[PDB]
Every structure is written in C-alpha cells, then in structure tokens.
Design an enzyme around this catalytic site. Structure first.
Site, short mmCIF file in Angstrom:
data_model
loop_
_atom_site.label_atom_id
_atom_site.label_comp_id
_atom_site.label_asym_id
_atom_site.label_seq_id
_atom_site.Cartn_x
_atom_site.Cartn_y
_atom_site.Cartn_z
N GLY A 71 -4.11 -8.36 -13.28
CA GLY A 71 -3.48 -8.05 -12.01
C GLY A 71 -2.04 -7.58 -12.12
O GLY A 71 -1.73 -6.66 -12.88
N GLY A 73 0.48 -8.90 -13.57
CA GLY A 73 1.17 -9.53 -14.69
C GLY A 73 1.75 -10.94 -14.74
O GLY A 73 2.14 -11.38 -15.83
N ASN A 95 -1.93 1.06 -10.46
CA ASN A 95 -0.69 0.54 -9.90
C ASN A 95 -0.28 -0.74 -10.60
O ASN A 95 0.91 -1.00 -10.79
CB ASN A 95 -0.83 0.28 -8.41
N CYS A 273 -12.08 -15.32 4.98
CA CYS A 273 -12.34 -15.96 3.69
C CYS A 273 -11.85 -17.40 3.60
O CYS A 273 -12.46 -18.21 2.90
CB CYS A 273 -11.74 -15.14 2.55
N1 SAH Z 1 -14.43 -4.78 -15.96
C1 SAH Z 1 -13.14 -5.16 -15.89
N2 SAH Z 1 -12.37 -5.23 -17.02
C2 SAH Z 1 -11.07 -5.62 -16.93
N3 SAH Z 1 -10.36 -5.98 -15.83
C3 SAH Z 1 -11.11 -5.92 -14.67
C4 SAH Z 1 -12.45 -5.55 -14.56
N4 SAH Z 1 -12.87 -5.61 -13.24
C5 SAH Z 1 -11.80 -6.02 -12.63
N5 SAH Z 1 -10.69 -6.23 -13.39
C6 SAH Z 1 -9.34 -6.69 -13.03
O1 SAH Z 1 -9.36 -8.07 -12.60
C7 SAH Z 1 -8.31 -8.27 -11.62
C8 SAH Z 1 -8.78 -8.95 -10.33
S1 SAH Z 1 -7.37 -9.56 -9.35
C9 SAH Z 1 -6.78 -10.93 -10.38
C10 SAH Z 1 -5.38 -10.67 -10.97
C11 SAH Z 1 -4.74 -11.77 -11.86
N6 SAH Z 1 -5.69 -12.38 -12.78
C12 SAH Z 1 -4.08 -12.82 -10.96
O2 SAH Z 1 -4.52 -13.99 -11.00
O3 SAH Z 1 -3.12 -12.47 -10.23
C13 SAH Z 1 -7.67 -6.90 -11.39
O4 SAH Z 1 -6.40 -6.82 -12.08
C14 SAH Z 1 -8.69 -5.92 -11.92
O5 SAH Z 1 -8.07 -4.71 -12.36
C1 10A Z 2 -20.30 -12.40 -1.25
C2 10A Z 2 -19.65 -11.15 -1.86
C3 10A Z 2 -18.44 -11.58 -2.68
C4 10A Z 2 -17.65 -10.47 -3.38
C5 10A Z 2 -16.50 -11.21 -4.06
C6 10A Z 2 -15.50 -10.30 -4.78
C7 10A Z 2 -14.40 -11.26 -5.23
C8 10A Z 2 -13.16 -10.53 -5.76
C9 10A Z 2 -12.14 -11.66 -5.95
C10 10A Z 2 -10.75 -11.08 -6.18
N1 10A Z 2 -9.50 -11.96 -6.13
C11 10A Z 2 -9.43 -12.91 -7.31
C12 10A Z 2 -8.33 -11.00 -6.26
C13 10A Z 2 -9.27 -12.86 -4.91
C14 10A Z 2 -9.23 -12.36 -3.44
C15 10A Z 2 -9.14 -13.51 -2.40
C16 10A Z 2 -10.38 -14.41 -2.24
C17 10A Z 2 -11.60 -13.69 -1.62
C18 10A Z 2 -12.80 -14.64 -1.54
C19 10A Z 2 -13.98 -13.91 -0.91
C20 10A Z 2 -15.19 -14.84 -0.82
C21 10A Z 2 -16.33 -14.08 -0.13
C22 10A Z 2 -17.56 -14.97 -0.05
#
Ligand code: SAH
Ligand code: 10A
Length: 291
Positions: A71, A73, A95, A273
């Site tokens: 994410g 960093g 970004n 959420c």
């Molecule tokens: N296949 C993949 N390989 C590597 N990174 C991935 C990915 N799919 C998603 N990500 C990365 O996983 C992150 C989800 S958001 C989490 C950000 C960070 N770990 C924090 O705790 O703040 C994003 O930075 C996204 O670019």
């Molecule tokens: C049911 C479908 C779920 C898709 C989930 C995708 C999750 C991406 C998570 C990404 N981060 C870690 C950046 C957190 C975002 C805030 C929490 C979201 C929680 C969503 C729960 C949906 C059931």
C-alpha cells in the site's frame, strides 16, 4: 504461470492519493487498525497494528523483509526504523509506488527500502521473513485466472523462498466457516445482498474472502503450520468509523477533488462495512505461519 489482477486492483487504489490522505491516518495505513489500549488514536492504533504483526516475525537486524501488497508504505517504513532490516515492497498500484518511492527518499538509511510494481505471482527472490496486511483478499483474483486454487501456488512459492526458520504473518479479512456461521445465526437480508453487490462492483472488483479452513488447507498443503490464530475483526469497527468520520469532516474538500458521486459511494462503503464486522458477518485474523 499466474497473472496479477492489475486493472481490478488499480480501479480502487489509484483513485487519488490526495483523496485517500483526506481520511486515512497520517501513515495512510489501509487495513484493520489495532487498539491495543482503549485510548489510542487511529494513528496510534495503526502503529500498534504494524508492531503486533512485525513482532511476530522475530526479526533480527540485517534480515530482508518482504511486504506483499505494501500500500502506501507504512509497514516498510516502520520495519526499517524499528527493527533495522532491509525491506522489499510489492504493489500493483502506480500511485502507491510513486508515493512510496518518494517517501523513502525523504529519510536516508543504510538498509534497503525497495518498492516495486510487481505482483506476488511474479516474485522470485530469497527473503527471510514475510508480512502481508490486507492484500490477501485480492490474491484469489487474477487477470483471467481467478480462483481459490491460486492460494496453493501462493503458500508453496513463499515456502520455498524462505529459510528453515521462515515465518509469514498473514493478515486478512475472513468469512465464517460453514458451521461457525450457523452458530452465529447470520442472516442475509435483501439489503445485505445489495450492499455486497455494491462493494464487488464499485469498490473491490474481484475481491474474495477466505474462510479459516481455506487458509489452513492451502498453507498446510505447502508445509506451513499456524503457530497462532489472532482474530481481531472487532477492531475494524473503530477503524472504519474513524475513516468514514474523517471523510465526512473533509467532505467539501473531497467533493472538490473527486466529485459528489465518488464521495457518496465511499461514505456508503465505509459505513456499510463497519456494521459487517460489528455484526460478525466478517472478521479479521493474523495467521502466524511457521515451519
Ligand atoms: N497480486 C498482487 N500482488 C501484489 N500486491 C497486490 C496484489 N493484489 C493486490 N495487491 C496490493 O495489496 C494492497 C491492498 S491495500 C493494503 C495496503 C497495506 N498492506 C496497508 O496495510 O496499508 C495494495 O497495495 C495492492 O496494490
Ligand atoms: C464479499 C466481497 C468482498 C470483497 C473484499 C475485497 C477486500 C479488499 C480489502 C482491502 N483493504 C485491506 C484495503 C481494506 C478496505 C476496508 C475493509 C473493507 C471490508 C469489506 C468487507 C465486505 C464483506
């Protein structure tokens, strides 16, 4: 070989850094915070969450830490500053890459601070310890090769890229096991189904949430053993509430940057959420995986 979910991941995370800054804590940590003490601010809870995860990797100075899905960093920056290790960060966001490349440039340190626009599916280097916070939910998604089966390649790949004393801290959201769900008495109102639809369409395209039994199966199949299951989903309520509030606060500023719609969408998503984690529909777990 597997194909990273680039467009799906970028559709969210490359929305605008200025935007995300408006409501995230100062370190822009974007995953479940950890209120280890009742009086922590979001920012202190995030630091507490990062520390919680990192202290489990038993990191010694000089080691190379791998942050899968780094994410903006924060974890990398924290890892170097508090444990004096080298860090490599993986992300698919442009970004986040841009932001981290610059953030690391600010403070100079002996150790390595690398951020790459490279998916876990393509990583091929030896590392000592691994940390992944809130990125796992995207791992069952791929550019055409989506499917849970992907977890298998994941836990094998990184089992082979780490030492005999290898450790992985897997932090991800989770859904109830077939059983544990019925005991909770979880219902699925029409409104809940509509929200999920909304999330999978406007917020996180391709996101898939694992059950604990799934993490066990695939991780063990590679030879990993869970030394500790640390469930902390309840913490996501304060977190998501803090984010939604901060966004309400800078609503005018945010409407300026991204418009009215984008802001309504995000408030709806942040608010909706929160209740999911409060109501036990979803949870958060930090798997301490060892060999
Ligand atoms: N296949 C993949 N390989 C590597 N990174 C991935 C990915 N799919 C998603 N990500 C990365 O996983 C992150 C989800 S958001 C989490 C950000 C960070 N770990 C924090 O705790 O703040 C994003 O930075 C996204 O670019
Ligand atoms: C049911 C479908 C779920 C898709 C989930 C995708 C999750 C991406 C998570 C990404 N981060 C870690 C950046 C957190 C975002 C805030 C929490 C979201 C929680 C969503 C729960 C949906 C059931």
């Amino acid at each position: 070989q597997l194909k990273p979910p680039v467009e799906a991941v970028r559709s969210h995370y490359d929305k605008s850094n200025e935007f995300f800054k408006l409501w995230l804590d100062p370190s822009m940590t974007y995953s479940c915070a950890y209120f280890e003490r009742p009086d922590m601010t979001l920012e202190e809870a995030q630091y507490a969450k990062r520390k919680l995860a990192l202290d489990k990797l038993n990191l010694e100075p000089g080691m190379t830490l791998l942050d899968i899905g780094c994410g903006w960093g924060s974890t990398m920056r924290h890892a170097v500053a508090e444990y004096d290790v080298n860090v490599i960060g993986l992300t698919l966001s442009e970004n986040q890459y841009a932001h981290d490349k610059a953030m690391f440039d600010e403070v100079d340190s002996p150790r390595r601070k690398e951020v790459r626009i490279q998916g876990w599916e393509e990583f091929d280097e030896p590392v000592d310890r691994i940390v992944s916070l809130g990125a796992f939910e995207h791992f069952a998604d791929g550019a055409g090769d989506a499917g849970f089966e992907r977890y298998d390649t994941f836990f094998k790949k990184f089992y082979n890229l780490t030492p005999d004393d290898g450790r992985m801290l897997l932090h991800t959201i989770t859904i109830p096991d077939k059983e544990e769900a019925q005991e909770l008495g979880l219902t699925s109102p029409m409104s809940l189904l509509r929200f999920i639809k909304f999330i999978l369409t406007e917020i996180f395209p391709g996101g898939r949430l694992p059950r604990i039994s799934q993490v066990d199966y695939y991780s063990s199949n590679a030879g990993w053993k869970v030394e500790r299951y640390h469930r902390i989903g309840a913490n996501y309520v304060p977190t998501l509430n803090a984010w939604a509030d901060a966004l309400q606060a800078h609503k005018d500023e945010a409407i300026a940057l991204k418009g009215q719609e984008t802001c309504d969408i995000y408030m709806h998503y942040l608010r909706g959420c929160s209740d999911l984690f409060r109501d036990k529909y979803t949870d958060v777990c930090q798997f301490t995986l060892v060999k």
